[PDB]
Each structure stands twice: as C-alpha cells, then as structure tokens.
Amino acid sequence: DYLQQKRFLATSQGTTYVYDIPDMFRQMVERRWRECIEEGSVDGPQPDNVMTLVELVVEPDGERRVVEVTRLPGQNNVGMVAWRLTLYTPECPDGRDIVLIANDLTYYMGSFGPQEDWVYFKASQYARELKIPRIYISVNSGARIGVAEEVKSDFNVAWLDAERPERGFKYLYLTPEVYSKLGALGSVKTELIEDEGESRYRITDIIGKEDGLGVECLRDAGLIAGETAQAYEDIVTISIVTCRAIGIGSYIVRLGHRVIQVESSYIILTGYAALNKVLGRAVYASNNQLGGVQVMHHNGVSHAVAPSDLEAVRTALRWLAFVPKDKLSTVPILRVSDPVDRPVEWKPPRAAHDPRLMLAGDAARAGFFDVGSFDEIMQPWAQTVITGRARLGGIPVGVIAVETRTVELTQPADPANLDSEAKTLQQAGQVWFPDSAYKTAQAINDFSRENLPIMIFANWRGFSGGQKDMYEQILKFGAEIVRALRGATAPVLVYIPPGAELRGGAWAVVDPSVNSLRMEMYADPEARGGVLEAEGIVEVKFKQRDILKTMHRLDPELLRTGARISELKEQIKEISKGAGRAAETRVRELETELLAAEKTAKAREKELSPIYHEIAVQFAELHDTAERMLEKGCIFEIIPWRDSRRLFYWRLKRLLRQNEQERRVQAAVKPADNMQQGPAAATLRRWFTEDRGETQSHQWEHDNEAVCKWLEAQAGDDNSVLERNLRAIHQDALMQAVNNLVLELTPSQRSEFIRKLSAL
Amino acid sequence: DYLQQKRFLATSQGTTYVYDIPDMFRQMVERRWRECIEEGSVDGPQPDNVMTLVELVVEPDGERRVVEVTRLPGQNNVGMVAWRLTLYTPECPDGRDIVLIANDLTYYMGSFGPQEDWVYFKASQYARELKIPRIYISVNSGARIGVAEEVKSDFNVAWLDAERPERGFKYLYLTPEVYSKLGALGSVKTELIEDEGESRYRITDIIGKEDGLGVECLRDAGLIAGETAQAYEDIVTISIVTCRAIGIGSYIVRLGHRVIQVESSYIILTGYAALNKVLGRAVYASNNQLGGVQVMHHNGVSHAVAPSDLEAVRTALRWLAFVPKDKLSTVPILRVSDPVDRPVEWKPPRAAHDPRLMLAGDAARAGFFDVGSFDEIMQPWAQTVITGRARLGGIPVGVIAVETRTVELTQPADPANLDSEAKTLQQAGQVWFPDSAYKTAQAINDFSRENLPIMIFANWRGFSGGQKDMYEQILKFGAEIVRALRGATAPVLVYIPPGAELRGGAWAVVDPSVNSLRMEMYADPEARGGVLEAEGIVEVKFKQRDILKTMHRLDPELLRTGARISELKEQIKEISKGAGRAAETRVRELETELLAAEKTAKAREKELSPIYHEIAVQFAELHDTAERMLEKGCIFEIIPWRDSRRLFYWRLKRLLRQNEQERRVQAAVKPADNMQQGPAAATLRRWFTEDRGETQSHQWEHDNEAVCKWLEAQAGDDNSVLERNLRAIHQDALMQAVNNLVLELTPSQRSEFIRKLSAL
C-alpha cells in the first residue's frame, strides 16, 4: 500500500496528507536560509538538519498522559496527529520548538469525537506548560454525528391497525428475544407493557454501546474551546484553514485569533443546504458564499490568505519569526543588513498618499523600516487603519498607520431578502470608524500577547460621530483601544509623522498617561495637535467682538474715524446752549456729518472681515505647534523624520535591555518585597552612577546608546557591578524573609527550630 | 446668596445642583426601608440616620493626597465634588461605604480641566484602594478649550501693504515694548527680525501663562480613561448621565459599563453644528438625534433609562443592593419573604410565550424567582436574549433567558444619505445573532465583575449562519461568550426549562467543560438536546436504503411478495432445459407474472414512504431525551420545574458557603503551597468525615441542606473541627516555609541567624 490510498483521497479532496505536513516546514526553513544568505541576516552555512520531529501520542486509559515517540507514519488510531518540532531557523540558529496539531480527513472526514478531542486538549496543555507556540491546521467536518445501530436493525413498530400501516403508529418497541440480547449492553431504557396478547418492551430511551453519537461530542467541544481560549491568553497560537472548517472547529479557528486561509477554503457554521431548507427556496448555491475568502478575509476573521498549503506554511513561519521562542525569552533580533545610519528619504507629503510607501519605499527614496521587512495582515478590512509587522534594525516591531485617502467600501447584497441591493460607502481618511477602531484594538491585543514592541504612526482628526456611526457603537470600540493599550506587555512608541494631525479624543486614547509604564510619545517638527481644529476655536473662543476690537486697534482709518467721532461728541458736550437758539443750526449739520462718521466706519468693518478672519485662523494655528507640546510636557522629545530610524532603534534597544534587567531585579527581591518598575529603574541608575561616576550620570536619560552598551557589557561579566549586587540583594531579601517568618512563629515551635537546626 | 443663583442655573439647565445630590440617596434609602417593612425582608425600625457623608478634598501641590473633611456646601475651587458615603441600607444594616463623584455645571459648564482630572483620578484611586464601589454623575461639556489672552490683547500684524490691508499679511509679530512685558512669563517663542526700519519679534509659537488651553487636558483625559478601565477591572462602577456627556466624558461613561440615562440626556462625541458644517447642509437639527435615549438605549450603551435624577438614584441603589459591600465580602442575602418551598406553577408552554412570565408571574401561577425581585437592564436592544438581575430566597442572581417569539427590528434611516430608507427585520426566537451574542457576553462580564451567581435558562437551536450574519462577524461575538464564561468569578448554573432545546454549537458554548470550576448543568425531564435536529439526522444517518430495509423487515405484504419472487427464482434455476423446447412455454408466463411480482412491490414501497419517514424521525428523536444526557454524564441531575426553586436555592447556598471556606483553606496554606480548588474541597470533605462519621459521608454530594447547616454551624464556633484544623495547617505551613528558606541560605549567614535567635 505504502500509504497511497490515503494520499490519493487527501489530494483528491484538496488537502496535503497529514504525515506529509512536517516536511513542508523543513523546505520553508531551508528557503529562508538561502534568502538570508543573500541579504546578510546570517552568514553561516545552512545546517545539515533543520527540523527534528517527535510524535506525541496520548495514553488511552491510565491518565491520558502525553508520551513522545518516534514511529513510522500512518499508524494513527485517532483523527488528529500532533508533533513537537525543533526548527533551526535563521533568527534562532541553536534551536526552537513548536507544537503542531493537525486533523485527518482520511479518518471519518475529520470529525470531532471525544478521543480526537483529548489529543487536542493534551497537546495544547503540553504547549502551554512548555510555553512554546502552537500551530493548528483545520481539516474538519464538525462534531461527530451518530445513530445507534443495534436497535436500528431490531426495532419493531406498534400499529393502530396492522392491515393498514399508513394510518399511524403508536410506539416503537422491542420483542423479548431482542431484549435478551440487548439488555446487558444498556442500549435501551424500556418499560414492560402487555399490549394485545404479547409482552412488549416499549422503548422510552435509546442509548448506544458506542460513543460519539450525540451530546458527548459537544461536552468535549467546550473543553477544546476553553483550552483554546486559555492558550490564547498564555501562548502564541496560529491557525491554518485548508479545505473546510464547519461548526465548532470554526470557533477554535477564531479562538486562535491568527488565521491563514487557503483560497479554496471555507469557514462556515451551517451548511448551505440546511439554510435553503429553512428559507424554503434555493437561496445559496455554495458554501463559499457563506464562508469563503471574500467574506472572512473582508470581515477580519481570516488575517492572511495564501494560494496553497505550502505558502500558508511560509506565512506561518514568517509570523513565527517575529515572536520569541518561548515566553521566558527576548524577541529574536537579527543582524543589521540595512544600515541604521541611513537617511529616511521618503517624506510624507501634505496631500493624500499611500502610507505603505513611507514604511517600505518606492524603489528609490528609502523609507523608515528595513527593505522588504514589511508584512501587513488585514489588508481589505477597515482600510483606514494599516496594521502589520516589520523589523527595525533586526528588532521585530508592530506597526499601526493611517491611510490619508478616501476608501470606497462595497457592501454586497443579501440573497435571502429580495429587496436588498449592493451599496457604495465613502469612508474618510483620518477618522476612526467602528471597523477601524475594532481593527486597532485587535492589532494591539495580538501584538501584546506576543510581546512585540508597537510603533504607532498617529494621524487622526477624531472619531466618527454621525447618527449611523453612533448607532453602530463607536463608543464601545473606542473604549476597546484604551483597554488594549492598558493591557500592554511591551514598549509602545507613538510618533506623529510630518504633515500629521492628532486632534480630539484620539489624543485621549493614545496618550502615554493611559499606561505610563509602557507608552511614550514623540513628534515631528512639522506636526500639529490640539483640542479642536482652528476654525472651531475661532467660532467658540475668538468671536465677532474680538475681531472688531482688533480692527479698531490695528486699522489706521478706523483709528482716525474714531478720533473724529470722539471730537464730534466733545463738540456736542461743549455746545449745550443754542436770538433764541442762535447756535442751533450748525448742530444739525454736525449731526449729519456725525452720520457721515458712524457710517463709513461700518463699511470698513465689512470690507475687512475676511482678512482678520485669516488673522484669527493663523492665531489659532500658532497654538497647535510642536514646541508648545514639548514645553507643556505632553511629548517626550522632538525627532526629525530624516533621523528617526537611528534614534528609535537605539531607544527601543535601550528599553528592551533595561526591561530585562528590571525583571531580574524584581525577581531578586521576591521573598522580601513586591517591587514596582520605578524602584528597579532607580536601582539600575544607582548601579550606573556607582560604576561610572557622578559626572557622567546624566547619560541615563540623554544617551540611549551608552546605556544599552553599558547594560550589554555588565550583563556578560560575572565580576560586574550588576551581578554581584543582584546576588547581595537576593541574600538580604532571604534574610528579611526568614526573620519575618520566624517572628510569626509560636514560642513552642521556635525552640524546636533553634535546637534542631543548631544540632546540625 | 445662600447658593440660590447656582441652584437657579442648574435647575434652569435641568440638573440637580451638586450639593443637593447626596440627600437624594438618603431619601431613596428611607423609601426602601418602608417597602421592606411591608414585605418582611427586614423587621427592625428604620434608623434615625441612614447616610453619613464626608467630603474628599485633594491637596493642591504637595503630593495631591486625599484629605477627608466636613465643611459647608458651596466652597469648591474645582469643577468636581467627591464624597464618601456610609449608607445604612436594608440589605446591609450595619454600614456600607461608597464613593460618589459629580461634576459642577456652575463651574465653566462642567468642562474637563486638569485639576478636575486629578480629583477624579485620586477619588477613583481611593475607591479602588478601599475596594468599595464607585458612582459617577456626568454633567460635562467635554475637554476645556482656551486661547492665550495677553497675546490676543497685544499682537500686531505685518502687512504686504499698509495702505491696503485686504490683500494679505505676512506674519504675526510683537513690538519690543510688548515683548518687554511678556518675555518673563514665557507666552511667546519668537525670533528677532529687523524688517523695514524697526525691530520686530516674529511669533513662532504661542504658549500660555495659564493652563487648560490645549493638549494638556487631552493628556490628563487619558489618565482618567486608564484609571476608569482599571476601576472597571477592580471594583464596581456605576455611571449616571443627566443632561449631557460630550467627548471624553462619554468614553468614561462607557468605561463604567453600567449606565443610567435620564430621558432628556444625550451622550454625543461631536455636536450637530460641526457635523452640518462638515456635510455642508442642515442634516441634523438636534443632539438628541445623535446621542439621545432612542439611540443609546437601543444600541446598548445606556443600560437603564430613568425619568428624573431621583429615579436614577433609585435605580443606582437598586443595582447596588445586589453587589457586595466590598471585594472581600459575600453577596447581601436578605431574609426569606417568599417561601422557598412554594410550587413553581407557571409552566413554560411549547408554543411561543413571554419568558418574563416564568420568572415573575402573571398575577396568579407564581413563577421561579421572588415576587417583584426581577429587574431587567437592556430591554429594547437584542431582544432575543433577556438579561437581568433577580433574587432567589434572598440571594442575588444574574439571569439570562431566551425569547421564543419573533422580534421585529426597525432600522432607521440615515439623514446624511438621501437614498437611505428605514427597514424592518424579522429575527427568529431561539437563535444567537451578533447583537444577541454580544449582549450575552456583556452580561456575563458585568455579572462576573460583581461576583454575582449566574443562572442561565438554555433554549437555543444554534447560531445564525447566513451570509449577512457571517459578514456581520457572528464568530467574533460567539467566541466572546466562551471567553466570558472562562473568566467567571462566581457559580454558574445552566438549566434547560421544560419545552426547551439545546442543539448545535450552543451546547459547546454553554457546556460545563468551558470552566469546570464554576459551571454546572441541569435539565428538565421534558428537555431535548442533540447535535442536530431530527430531520437532519434522518438526512445524514437514516437514508433511503435503511428505510427500504425496514419496509422489507416489518411489512407483511412485502414479506409475502419477496418469498414469491424467491420461489419464482428457484423455478428459474430448476427449469434450465426447455419436441425441442417443449417446456419453454411456461417460462414466458412465469416471466410475465414475475414482472407482476416485482411491480406492486414497488407500489407498496412508494405508498408506505411517509409513515416510515415518521418512524425514522421518531427513532431519531428518541436519542435526544434527558435520561441519555444523564447517563452519558453531560448533565449533573434531572430537576423538575415544580421543585426547581427549593433545589437550586439549597445548591446555590451550598456553593456560596463552600467557596468561602475553600478560600480560607487556600489562604491558610499560602506560605508553603499554592493550593487549587480540588484539594481544598477534599480537605473540607475529610473534615466533614472526621466530624460526622464514615457512615454519613455520601451527604457531601447528595444533601446540600446538611452541608449548608454544617458549614454555618462550624463557621461560628471556635472549638469546632474547621477552625482548629485551619490553625494547625497554617502553623505547619509556616514551619515548612521557614525550613525551606533556611535551607536556601549560605553557611556563614546561617550561623549568625542561629546565634541571634539563641541569644533571644
């Protein structure tokens, strides 16, 4: 046979056979080596063996423990196969372990039954307790459906009239000789009824000697769902869909939250035939309408799409290259193929542009990140926000940016409703919508679970606040970004690019004060920020009376006319009296000339309105500049666009090394005190001032290169200041802990403790 | 004055003045006493003082610490007032503390300036560090906007031509004598430019000597947002909106997650005039269209709506009556007014009905919960799922139920788009939709933060799987119920009512195996559950061949006709040969009568098709019953509907006592070992078997009443088994901890420890 029929069935339905899955990983690892050899991320020759596989088999009955074996392919007795893989990758050359779980389409169409479910449970438990990432490939038909067959070949029917069966039947019963066979196995729950002239066993309930018929599959489905949620919280989970995912398997896919879909796949819950039976007419013609690429890639369930299974393996290893090898380690930092001292020569223009060109480049005018390092995940969903992963100097970075072009969104028709039609929606550039805000929160959550540093490029003028968007819950998804930023496990760096604006509640969302431990903000010299735009501040705070006062203060003709009116009023006050009323007549003339004075001082106040309106707008715009943001303390430092790469590289590297040593200091003090981040940073600063001196102690804040090189120097040596002081601090913490717990003891136990431990 | 003008301004705009806010709580507490005296939940007379208020004032400059004072009303220098209130409620008669935060409309329209932000920050920190609930009242105009006024008074312009100002201006500048006055205060960043014949100071930037003008309010707004998110995770937060909530305040409202809205309120992000200025025409005529009750109560941001501020205070204290007084205490259990031994006489019918009637009653045929205890929160949003709070025997319970009637949903028109029209959508009864699933997840989260027991009434046939609901992210909101059930902090009891079905992936969502520590499942005798409905299992697993085999096995005419065809086949086999071919003539007649035999055995197989289809449907329906679910282990016990109240009361009380004593056992061991729930329950069972006996040890599982009375008996006495063994295990844990932390020490340090203890 040599596994030919299983391969034929899997290839005919469109799936790589399960025991041919690991070798694909091997090939892609080899390809990465060759590409890195062309780029210079690694320089060594490719190793002879790049993958070592050990198969995990669960014990059947004792305690269902996981036993690692090496055996020939094709010997499975259940519907999933799991391996542990050691991969010798360019980013991790010594070794790196993952756990791979895959279904079997040759075994009952990949259905979910209990013995299949315990394999997933124990493999995900193994991946969680070893803290290594998990990759699941889904080829499934859903939960297992079954009908008991020993009763099916033996049940009898109680008729109203035996001559005419078409009228109806009363109950389903078993004869006594059938019950003599089936009574021991516990397949039926029955009642002894003497109807007509014979003893009959009326079937009340049907049970099976076999398992997997009914709700016992759905009991372990919730076990998989809870374990997949727990694995999402505790490790990095990647899911691949190749042919189909029906029902509960789809939920496991969404409980992975990182989904790669082949172009011929579908992720559905209810099949199209059942929906046409419910709706009564042939509404749907395929399951690709319900759950294909054009639905799941455009709503955000499927992150990336791949043409084949091998390309999906390549995308999975690309995503795995960014994350650390386990939860106790630092992110994989490659070598510097692209110089960090190079200029960033693609400047973001004021007009509408493509933000991916400022991150990658346009075959000249090189951009921010490394050449070719950029990978974006949810492209056709919520295209206002661009979310992806890249590398800066070899350091993995999560990237969020804002498209400044209008987005046309086509909402397709619903074929269940005849009146429904497709619609075109125009979405503005720099505005969070419900989908864009939910995308941003999802991206921050997914980068926070993998401990990836996030750099956000901030260009927002606010939220959407129209009636349709207020009905579509903009407040909820706006709050989810605040919660996601609050649950950050990595440094977050917000940077305002040239020509970008950060206004309104968007500043309140992305401010460093949401999570002060993990967030910083920087701005370009040509960056604007404020509560409102300039026209709104002119409407609310610099109104018509101020404009007219400005005209009477700075216009020469209005000054001279006002002086004329004042002298006329003095001429009124001096000439109070006036034969009788002889001096009256000139007063009348003066009144007309005073009407020539107040008028034509109104013609100047209407001719000069737009120019002092532009003075108002300029005066409002001078409050929005970067130097006021630096002086008020809202931003940390002003970084130019041309020198952004080097400075952010050294700052990110300094924060990574500093956070690692702060975790070591908090680990050392654990018996005595629960130490926060600030005392740990102060302790490292005190060791820095002890090692260097009081003259060079300012460089802890200013120089981000000297601190990082100092940390990498002091971490290696065991005669260093840092390691010796960590050992001394740990011993003092042990002393304080033992002192407290011996003061908490009783006088009776204390004497036993002293005499037994002084007896030695 | 006696605060008359401030009350006039607040009452004219429609808001209760801030120093009249506490007294309302007083009145409502008094009302509750009278109502409870009529019901019998309390018996004692009403206390003389039911509320004690102490005002919290932040220090201005030293460390911004909270100082508690008692002073005359009307002396605020900031726009927020905060108090700590001791309330002597019927559920908590001894005392109960909350923290109340309220804005001031009389102080700059309730705007958010930095000092107000620090009052909110420090008051919420006080509420979190005392672990007591927080109530906030939102009367706000948003973030504070400002313009520097000295530069506004004294700026000058540089003209292209001074004779004609209308052509344009070059820059905004200051004269030297103005710069001599304003140089020391740091209001301008300028450059010395000699243009024309005079020295000029070209204003590059404008800064203010005052604060609150710009982005610093947006900086402290993120501080409020992060603290409000943290307070949502750590304590219970309730928010009330009375006149308006604009901008960041709205987000704080959503970060409370429990919202009471007055009928004249609005919760908006952008005003109507700004949206009409963007859209260019008069689209909106009010802010009630963007943020009123008809939007927020129908999308789910506003939980409850109240006609006035007094009724909102009543609703807030109603919600506060369910939750415990602090995070270290057990839920308030009132006295038994309605007897727990009464029958539940409103049976849920098979037809479409109102699920509120089985929970409350219909002025006869009393329902499940207490009479009048039911309070539902989100009524007009996602009306498939009914979510609320009630009381069982005095115990607070969170309630989730399923409406079995078709819901008409009216989607209103969008005034921005001219082609938009209103739509009517029909939603089925027993199906999770995106809004219904998101409502269920929100309800489980809000009940889990308050440590309230949840009882779920499970009647679902699955999820919605059409193309429109797949595009509207059904999987995303279906996974959130699994995550919310996984993050449960309280006992969860799922019960299938009579006449209810739990089918498909809904069972996988609400199974006990998602969170086995906190979830249980029970079912009525007349309850159905399965993977699919019976017709689908007939399509998949009882097809045409099995039906025809059943006809040939159980129908008499087919049995006789098959025997006839068999005998004619034997007559074919015997007559092989056949003057020549003399016996061939009977073979033709046999062929005709064999064709007459095979036909009319096909007429019987088409006449009998519907009746054996009903036999197939009945045989499939017999697998879905309750006793199969009990025998397979999926449900815990079968509980009838008439006796559900007593049994669920005693089980819930047993779990509530047992979890508290398990937490005491895990607290006792904590120096030595981190103990899970299972060893704690086993330890309590071993103490139970030690006290009672080896014979009466089954009652730990069967009799909940005996376990309740045993735990409540030995919680009080200090000579009991439980208290003595807790002290013994704590002392042994201390001894083991000291032994281990001495064995981790160095030899030189150990000798100093020995001599310092032996010196005593």
* Three-class DSSP labels, B416-458: CCCCCCCEEEEECCCEECHHHHHHHHHHHHHHHHCCCCEEEEC
Which amino acid belongs to residue B754?
I
Which amino acid belongs to residue A168?
G
Minimum distance, in Å, between the CA of residue A665 and any CA atom of chain B: 18
Closest-CA residue to A229 (of B478, B613, B281) = B478
Q: Is B562 left (phi over 0), alpha (psi -120 to 50) or beta?
A: alpha
| Number of residues assigned to chain B | 760
For residue A517 the two structure tokens come to 């431990």
Where are the strands (E) in A481-620, listed by range? Answer: 492-496, 501-503, 519-523, 528-530
Q: Is B327 helix (H, G, I), strand (E, B) or coil?
A: coil
Where are the strands (E) in B213-337, listed by range? Answer: 237-241, 245-246, 259-262, 267-268, 304-306
Under an 8 A CB cutoff, do A270 and B671 touch? no
Residues of chain B with CATH 2.40.460.10: 149-206
Give the residue from A248, A267, A470 with the most B CB atoms within 10 Å of its CB, the best one to mutate. A470
Under an 8 A CB cutoff, do A207 and B628 touch? yes
Closest-CA residue to B253 (of B271, B237, B264, B236) = B237
- How many other β-carbons are positioned within 10 Å of the β-carbon of residue A745? 17
Which amino acid belongs to residue B461?
R
CA B67 – CA B58 distance, rounded (Å): 6
For residue B582 the two structure tokens come to 């003399």
| Distance from the Cα of residue A472 to its chain's centroid | 21
The count of C-alpha atoms lying within 13 angstroms of the C-alpha of A114, restricted to the half-sphere facing its C-beta, is: 17
Q: CA A572 → CA A576, A586, A595, distances in Å?
A: 7, 11, 14
For residue B142 the two structure tokens come to 């948003």
Cβ contacts of A734 on chain B, cutoff 8 Å: 741, 744-745
For B211, the closest chain A residue by CA position comes to A632
Q: CA A134 → CA A58, A234, A248, A353, B480, distances in Å?
A: 17, 11, 19, 38, 21
CA A98 – CA A25 distance, rounded (Å): 11
Q: Which residues contact A696 (CB under 8 A, 6 or more apart)?
A: none
- Asked if B22 and B83 touch (Cβ cutoff 8 Å), the reply is yes
Can you say whether the dihedral through the CA atoms of B734, B735, B737, B742 is positive or negative? positive
Is B149-206 a domain of CATH 2.40.460.10?
A: yes
- Tell me the sheet residues that pair with A669: none
- Asked if B83 and B54 touch (Cβ cutoff 8 Å), the reply is yes
For residue B612 the two structure tokens come to 């054996």
Minimum distance, in Å, between the CA of residue A591 and any CA atom of chain B: 29
CA B642 – CA B526 distance, rounded (Å): 13
Query: Residues of A227-239 as b/e, b for ≥16 C-beta within 10 angstroms?
Result: bbbbbbeebbbbb
Q: Is A331 helix (H, G, I), strand (E, B) or coil?
A: coil
Gap between the terminal Cα atoms of chain A: 70
CA A250 – CA A244 distance, rounded (Å): 9
Which amino acid belongs to residue A601?
A
Q: CA A485 → CA A489, A506, A507, B216, B231, distances in Å?
A: 9, 13, 13, 19, 15
Closest-CA residue to A457 (of A319, A351, A357, A334) = A357
Closest-CA residue to A392 (of A640, A36, A644) = A644
For residue A284 the two structure tokens come to 């749907």
- Asked if A463 and A505 touch (Cβ cutoff 8 Å), the reply is yes
Q: CA B160 → CA A293, B164, B165, B173, distances in Å?
A: 61, 8, 8, 14
- Tell me the sheet residues that pair with B589: none
| Distance from the Cα of residue A629 to its chain's centroid | 29
The DSSP H or E segment spanning A440 is helix A434-449
- Asked if A527 and A496 touch (Cβ cutoff 8 Å), the reply is yes
Q: Which residues contact B567 (CB under 8 A, 6 or more apart)?
A: none
Under an 8 A CB cutoff, do B473 and A299 touch? yes
- Asked if B654 and B646 touch (Cβ cutoff 8 Å), the reply is no
Under an 8 A CB cutoff, do B204 and A625 touch? yes
Which amino acid belongs to residue B704?
N
B474-486 and A215-234 helices cross at what angle (nearest 10)?
80
DSSP string across B77-138: SSSEEEEEEEE--SSSSS--EEEEEEE-TTTGGG-B-HHHHHHHHHHHHHHHHTT--EEEEE
Minimum distance, in Å, between the CA of residue B406 and any CA atom of chain A: 15
CA A642 – CA A624 distance, rounded (Å): 22
Q: What is the DSSP letter of B354?
A: -
Please, is B229 exposed, middle or buried when counting C-beta atoms within 10 Å of its C-beta (0-12, 13-18, 19+)? buried
Minimum distance, in Å, between the CA of residue A678 and any CA atom of chain B: 17
- How many other β-carbons are positioned within 10 Å of the β-carbon of residue A577? 7
Closest-CA residue to B222 (of B256, B248, B203, B246) = B248
Q: Is B713 helix (H, G, I), strand (E, B) or coil?
A: helix
Under an 8 A CB cutoff, do A270 and B147 touch? no
Q: Return contacts of A686-695, CB within 8 angstroms, 24+ apart.
A: A687/A714, A687/A721, A687/A722, A687/A725, A690/A721, A691/A721
Q: Is A670 left (phi over 0), alpha (psi -120 to 50) or beta?
A: alpha
| Pairing between β-strand B407-411 and β-strand B423-427 as defined by DSSP bridges | antiparallel
CA A145 – CA B504 distance, rounded (Å): 11
- Tell me the sheet residues that pair with A99: A84, A134
Closest-CA residue to A456 (of A390, A504, A505) = A390
The DSSP H or E segment spanning A66 is strand A66-69
CA A440 – CA A387 distance, rounded (Å): 7
Closest-CA residue to B242 (of B227, B223, B263, B258) = B263
Under an 8 A CB cutoff, do B214 and A530 touch? yes
DSSP string across B458-526: --B-EE--SHHHHHTTHHHHHHHHHHHHHT--S-EEEEEPTT-EEETHHHHHS-GGGSTTTEEEEE-TT
Resolution (A): 3.1
CA A540 – CA B148 distance, rounded (Å): 14
| Distance from the Cα of residue A245 to its chain's centroid | 23
- Asked if A614 and A608 touch (Cβ cutoff 8 Å), the reply is no
CA A474 – CA A468 distance, rounded (Å): 10
* Percentage helix, strand, coil for chain B under 3-state DSSP, each rounded to 5: 45, 15, 35
- Asked if A734 and B744 touch (Cβ cutoff 8 Å), the reply is yes
CA B461 – CA B530 distance, rounded (Å): 10
Please, is B4 exposed, middle or buried when counting C-beta atoms within 10 Å of its C-beta (0-12, 13-18, 19+)? exposed
- Asked if A28 and A317 touch (Cβ cutoff 8 Å), the reply is yes
For residue B148 the two structure tokens come to 């520097």
| Pairing between β-strand A407-411 and β-strand B80-87 as defined by DSSP bridges | unpaired
Gaps in chain A (C to N distance exceeding 2.5 A) after: 578
Q: What is the DSSP letter of A720?
A: S
For residue A523 the two structure tokens come to 């701005």
- Asked if A632 and B216 touch (Cβ cutoff 8 Å), the reply is yes
- How many other β-carbons are positioned within 10 Å of the β-carbon of residue A636? 15
Under an 8 A CB cutoff, do B204 and A627 touch? yes
Q: Token match 């540089």: residue?
A: B158
- How many other β-carbons are positioned within 10 Å of the β-carbon of residue A638? 15
Under an 8 A CB cutoff, do A219 and B615 touch? no
Cβ contacts of B251 on chain A, cutoff 8 Å: 475, 478-479, 482, 505, 508
- Asked if A337 and A96 touch (Cβ cutoff 8 Å), the reply is no
CA A530 – CA A536 distance, rounded (Å): 11
* Four-way CATH pick for A355-532+634-638: 3.40.50.300, 3.50.50.60, 3.20.20.150, 3.90.226.10: 3.90.226.10
Q: Is B542 helix (H, G, I), strand (E, B) or coil?
A: coil
CA B56 – CA B78 distance, rounded (Å): 12
Q: How many CB pairs under 8 A join A and B?
A: 417
In degrees and rounded to multiples of 5, residue B158 shows phi and psi of -110, 115
Which amino acid belongs to residue A437?
A
CA B189 – CA B490 distance, rounded (Å): 59
- Asked if B516 and B475 touch (Cβ cutoff 8 Å), the reply is no
Nearest CB to B529 within list A151, A215, A471 = A215
Cβ contacts of B381 on chain A, cutoff 8 Å: none
Rg (CA), chain A: 37
- Asked if A635 and A523 touch (Cβ cutoff 8 Å), the reply is yes
Q: Token match 């041309």: residue?
A: A642
Q: CA A341 → CA A100, A357, A366, distances in Å?
A: 40, 20, 12
Give the residue from A175, A269, A535 with the most B CB atoms within 10 Å of its CB, the best one to mutate. A269
Minimum distance, in Å, between the CA of residue A243 and any CA atom of chain B: 18
Nearest CB to B222 within list A144, A151, A513 = A513
Residues of chain B with CATH 3.90.226.10: 4-144+215-233+303-321, 355-531
Under an 8 A CB cutoff, do A206 and B628 touch? yes
Cβ contacts of A468 on chain B, cutoff 8 Å: 414, 416
User: Experimental method used, please?
Assistant: cryo-EM
Nearest CB to B215 within list A168, A207, A632 = A632
- Asked if A111 and A143 touch (Cβ cutoff 8 Å), the reply is yes
- How many other β-carbons are positioned within 10 Å of the β-carbon of residue B587? 15
Is B355-531 a domain of CATH 3.40.50.2000?
A: no
| Number of residues assigned to chain A | 760
- Asked if B79 and B86 touch (Cβ cutoff 8 Å), the reply is no
Query: Residues of A646-657 as b/e, b for ≥16 C-beta within 10 angstroms?
Result: bbbbbbbbbbbb
Nearest CB to A758 within list B152, B622, B758 = B758
The DSSP H or E segment spanning A397 is strand A395-402
CA B431 – CA B424 distance, rounded (Å): 18
Closest-CA residue to B653 (of B493, B546, B502, B468) = B493
Cβ contacts of A169 on chain B, cutoff 8 Å: 611, 614-615, 618
Can you say whether the dihedral through the CA atoms of B317, B318, B321, B324 is positive or negative? negative
Cβ contacts of B172 on chain A, cutoff 8 Å: 615, 618-619, 622
Cβ contacts of A508 on chain B, cutoff 8 Å: 143, 218, 221-222, 225, 248, 251
Could you tell me the CATH superfamily of domain B4-144+215-233+303-321? 2-enoyl-CoA Hydratase; Chain A, domain 1 (3.90.226.10)
Cβ contacts of A382 on chain B, cutoff 8 Å: none
Q: What is the fold of A4-145+214-322?
A: 2-enoyl-CoA Hydratase; Chain A, domain 1 (3.90.226)
Q: What is the DSSP letter of A520?
A: E
Gap between the terminal Cα atoms of chain B: 70
Q: Which residues contact B494 (CB under 8 A, 6 or more apart)?
A: B455, B456, B458, B510, B512, B519, B520, B521, B522
Output the CA angle B554-B558-B559, nearest 5 degrees. 70
- Asked if B636 and B513 touch (Cβ cutoff 8 Å), the reply is no
For residue B538 the two structure tokens come to 């007939």
CA A679 – CA A312 distance, rounded (Å): 46
- Tell me the sheet residues that pair with A407: A427
Q: CA A267 → CA A244, A256, B348, distances in Å?
A: 6, 14, 36
CA A193 – CA A212 distance, rounded (Å): 31
Output the CA angle A410-A415-A418, nearest 5 degrees. 105
Rg (CA), chain B: 37
| Pairing between β-strand B80-87 and β-strand A267-268 as defined by DSSP bridges | unpaired
Q: Token match 């062929």: residue?
A: B591
- Asked if B512 and B521 touch (Cβ cutoff 8 Å), the reply is yes
Cβ contacts of A671 on chain B, cutoff 8 Å: 741
Cβ contacts of A204 on chain B, cutoff 8 Å: 622, 625, 627
DSSP string across A622-664: TTSSHHHHHHTTSSSEE--STTHHHHHHHHHHHHHHHHHHHHH
- Asked if B230 and B262 touch (Cβ cutoff 8 Å), the reply is no
CA A386 – CA A372 distance, rounded (Å): 17
Under an 8 A CB cutoff, do A467 and B742 touch? no
Where are the strands (E) in A420-465, listed by range? Answer: 423-427, 431-432, 454-457, 462-463
- Tell me the sheet residues that pair with A57: A67
Q: What is the fold of A156-206?
A: ClpP/crotonase fold (2.40.460)
- Asked if B148 and A619 touch (Cβ cutoff 8 Å), the reply is no
Output the CA angle B124-B129-B130, nearest 5 degrees. 100
For residue A206 the two structure tokens come to 């049907």
DSSP string across A472-496: TTHHHHHHHHHHHHHT--S-EEEEE
- Asked if B112 and B249 touch (Cβ cutoff 8 Å), the reply is yes
Closest-CA residue to A622 (of A561, A542, A563) = A542
For residue B487 the two structure tokens come to 């993050």
Minimum distance, in Å, between the CA of residue B466 and any CA atom of chain A: 6
CA A444 – CA A385 distance, rounded (Å): 12
Under an 8 A CB cutoff, do A251 and B479 touch? yes
Cβ contacts of A620 on chain B, cutoff 8 Å: 147
CA A41 – CA A64 distance, rounded (Å): 43
| Pairing between β-strand A245-246 and β-strand A267-268 as defined by DSSP bridges | parallel
Cβ contacts of A472 on chain B, cutoff 8 Å: 299
